[PDB]
Every structure is written in structure tokens, then in C-alpha cells.
């Protein structure tokens, strides 16, 4: 009847597993992320299987966002704050990518970024 008290789901091992695949190595992307990219590249290569993939891709985007959500609400705020900018910026680019994929079927970054874009 009343408003349920604020509580947060803790950090799952699968969260960390995804995190590590997102921020993997300097010469290689983590399996999950490498994949997460291939899919967005493909759904941007067509605009009419596709609708079933985009549904499963948006699921993945949600996982990224949820990962941040749980990562933040954890007891140890030291770990979080130490790499907040990274997790936040991945969470954000996933929202704008999810939102762009939802739109595809249903029809920023600073000055430093604008300079990076205009390069091979």
C-alpha cells in the first residue's frame, strides 16, 4: 500500500564480466564489447531477422546501463568514484545508441572529440 523503501540490487559477477569486456585491453576489445559493436555496425548497414537482432541488442544496452546503476549504488563508493567517468561515459553512449536503434525500426564529447572525428 505504502511506497517501498529504497533498495538496490548488488553487483553481480556478470556485471564485472561485462565491465572488463568493455574496458578490456589496449590492443583488443573484450568478447562482449567486440560483439556489442558488430551488431550496432550491422543494424546501421540496413533499414527496412533485423528486428529480432535489434531486440537482442537493446537487451545488451540495458545490461550496460543496469551495470552502471548497480555499480554506483554499491557500498564501496571508493572503487566507483575511482573509475566513475569511464562507466558513466559508457552508460551514456549506450543510451544514445539504444535510442538510435529503437528509432531505426520505428520510422557532445567536447572540442577534443570533434577533432578526433575528422581523422582516419
Amino acid at each position: 500500500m505504502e511506497k517501498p523503501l529504497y533498495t538496490a540490487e548488488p553487483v553481480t559477477l556478470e556485471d564485472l564480466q561485462l565491465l572488463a569486456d568493455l574496458f578490456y585491453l589496449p590492443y583488443e576489445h573484450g568478447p562482449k564489447g567486440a560483439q556489442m559493436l558488430r551488431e550496432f555496425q550491422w543494424l546501421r548497414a540496413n533499414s527496412s531477422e533485423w528486428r529480432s537482432r535489434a531486440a537482442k541488442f537493446e537487451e545488451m544496452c540495458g545490461l550496460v546501463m543496469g551495470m552502471f546503476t548497480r555499480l554506483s549504488n554499491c557500498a564501496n563508493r571508493t572503487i566507483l568514484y575511482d573509475m566513475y567517468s569511464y562507466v558513466w561515459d559508457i552508460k551514456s553512449i549506450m543510451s544514445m545508441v539504444k535510442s538510435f536503434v529503437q528509432w531505426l525500426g520505428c520510422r557532445r564529447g567536447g572540442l577534443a572529440g570533434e577533432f578526433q572525428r575528422l581523422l582516419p
Binding site: 500500500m1 511506497k3 517501498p4 561515459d89 564529447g109 567536447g110
Partner: protein, 302 residues
């Protein structure tokens, strides 16, 4: 005339440390600014777990901080955000909220704020019964706290529909805003972000439109230099897009700046140059204000 001009630490992300806050006051005092609104979104004991009473070590820290605000001639406004899980009707909730603020009053705080921003617009079935609209519940508990706190000189209220692009159907005809305007006590001030969450411009007519329904001049919570929506961006530009012709039509301007405390020199200094330029109602040039700000800052590096 009373005008609340200063800084609001009301962003998401890592909150500022006490020694930073103390330094903020020195900067605000130096630049003839007068207010500080304590609202860190990530302080557990402010938003998520608002019910929690302050610890003993935590209490000593706040007491010192409020003392610093007194010493530097800065009004310390303490904000609390219950909106997440509060049950408006249950008087045990309203009681716990009263107990919390009572503790804060013991630290030396005289100005308070009740915030109902970035919260689910849905009331629980229990509250749905007891109160007509969401605004009715919010106005009720606020007026109650205002009165219980002995009607402070400074009591700020933050509505959920805090900007134009959040008002359903629109600002002039929002049934939420009408409730606030009418039922919310004329003593209590209302926070506003302008036509948007990060307003590029704040047109005088937008402030005349919202004042109409809220039945008073709003206190601006400015997000011009706020960077908690893509931490990939830093904003060292000057306060710009707000007419000095707004100063007599507002009860204040509290800016929510960059999360990086050191980054806010130019944004606070330019806010000061803006307010100072026309306290009594082209008096201001962002480009000019910026140079002034930049020349002062240069001193901090040597």
C-alpha cells in the same frame, strides 16, 4: 531587497569535501555573493537514505562547515530530498523528516530546502487515497515542515516540473504548477531551471510565464556549467544567456556547476560580475566578464 545569489552543490557524482566547501565560501565572500545550497545528490543521508540521522563524526563536520558559512557571511541552506521512497500520508514519515531537520538545526542551520526533483511522478496507493494530486501531497508536507521549523526566513521548495520542457500540458496551463502556486504557502520560495534542464537562454517572458502560475518570482537553479550528463565535458566559459533584466524579476540565482570543484572559478566569478552589474532594478558582457574572471584566476597558479 533580499536576493539569493550563489552556488548550489546539487549535482550527481562525487560530492565536494569539507575543505573545498570552506574554500568555496571564501571565494563567494570575496565576490560579494551570499548563498550556498547544500544538495549533493550522491550524499546517502540527503536523497537515498534521507531518514538516516547524522553520525557523531559527521555531525562535528557539518557543525564546523555551518560555522565557516557564518564566518564568511554565506547563508547555508540545507536541502533534503525524500521523493524516492517517502509515504506522504504516514505521519511516522513526516515525523522522521522533522527529527532529521531538528538535528540539522542543532548544528547551527537556519535555512532549509525540501527537494522533490528527479522523482517518479507516481504516488503509492496509500498516498493516492489521502491526497488529490501529487502536488497536493508535496505542498502539504512542505507547508507542514515550513510551519514546524518556525517558518524560516529562507525555505526553498523544488517542484518535480522544475523547467518548461517538463510541464504537462505547458507552463501557463500546468495543473501541477497551479496547485503549487495556490496551495504552497507564500512564504516558501520555488526553485526553477528555466525553459530546460540546461537552458541555453532564460528569456524574461519565460520567467513572467512561470511567475504567473507559481504566484511569485522563482529562485533559479542554473545548470549552464553543470557537467553531470557527459563527464567528457568541462565548462570554463562565462555565465551567458541570462539578461541583467531578469535580476529584478527573480528571487535569486544559485548555479550548479562542474563536478570538478577547481573548474568553477570562471563560472562563479562571472555569475558575481553578472549580479553585481545590476543588483538595483548592456550592463554585462560575457566576453568581458570572462577576461575579468581569467585575470583573477591566473593568480591561483603561481
Amino acid at each position: 531587497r533580499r536576493f539569493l545569489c550563489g552556488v548550489v552543490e546539487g549535482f550527481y557524482g562525487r560530492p565536494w569535501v569539507m575543505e573545498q566547501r570552506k574554500e568555496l565560501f571564501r571565494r563567494l565572500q570575496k565576490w560579494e555573493l551570499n548563498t550556498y545550497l547544500y544538495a549533493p545528490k550522491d550524499d546517502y543521508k540527503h536523497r537515498m537514505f534521507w531518514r538516516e540521522m547524522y553520525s557523531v563524526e559527521e555531525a562535528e563536520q557539518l557543525m564546523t562547515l555551518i560555522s565557516a558559512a557564518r564566518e564568511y557571511e554565506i547563508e547555508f541552506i540545507y536541502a533534503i530530498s525524500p521523493g524516492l521512497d517517502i509515504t506522504f500520508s504516514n505521519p511516522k514519515e513526516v515525523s522522521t523528516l522533522k527529527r532529521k531537520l531538528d538535528q540539522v538545526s542543532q548544528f547551527g542551520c537556519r535555512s532549509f530546502a525540501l527537494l522533490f526533483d528527479d522523482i517518479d511522478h507516481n504516488m503509492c496507493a496509500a498516498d493516492k487515497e489521502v491526497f488529490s494530486s501529487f502536488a497536493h501531497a508535496q505542498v502539504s508536507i512542505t507547508n507542514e515542515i515550513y510551519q514546524y521549523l518556525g517558518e524560516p526566513e529562507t525555505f526553498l521548495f523544488c517542484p518535480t516540473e522544475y523547467c518548461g520542457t517538463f510541464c504537462y500540458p505547458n507552463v501557463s496551463q500546468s495543473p501541477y504548477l497551479r496547485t503549487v502556486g495556490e496551495k504552497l504557502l507564500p512564504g516558501i520560495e520555488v526553485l526553477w531551471t528555466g525553459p530546460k534542464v540546461v537552458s541555453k537562454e532564460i528569456p524574461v517572458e519565460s520567467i513572467e510565464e512561470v511567475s504567473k502560475i507559481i504566484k511569485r518570482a522563482p529562485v533559479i537553479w542554473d545548470n549552464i556549467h553543470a557537467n553531470d550528463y557527459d563527464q567528457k565535458r568541462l565548462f570554463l566559459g562565462p555565465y551567458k544567456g541570462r539578461s541583467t533584466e531578469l535580476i529584478p524579476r527573480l528571487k535569486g540565482v544559485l548555479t550548479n556547476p562542474n563536478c570538478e570543484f577547481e573548474a568553477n572559478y570562471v563560472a562563479i566569478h562571472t555569475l558575481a560580475t553578472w549580479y553585481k552589474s545590476n543588483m538595483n532594478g548592456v550592463l554585462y558582457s560575457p566576453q568581458m566578464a570572462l577576461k575579468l574572471a581569467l585575470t583573477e584566476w591566473l593568480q591561483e597558479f603561481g
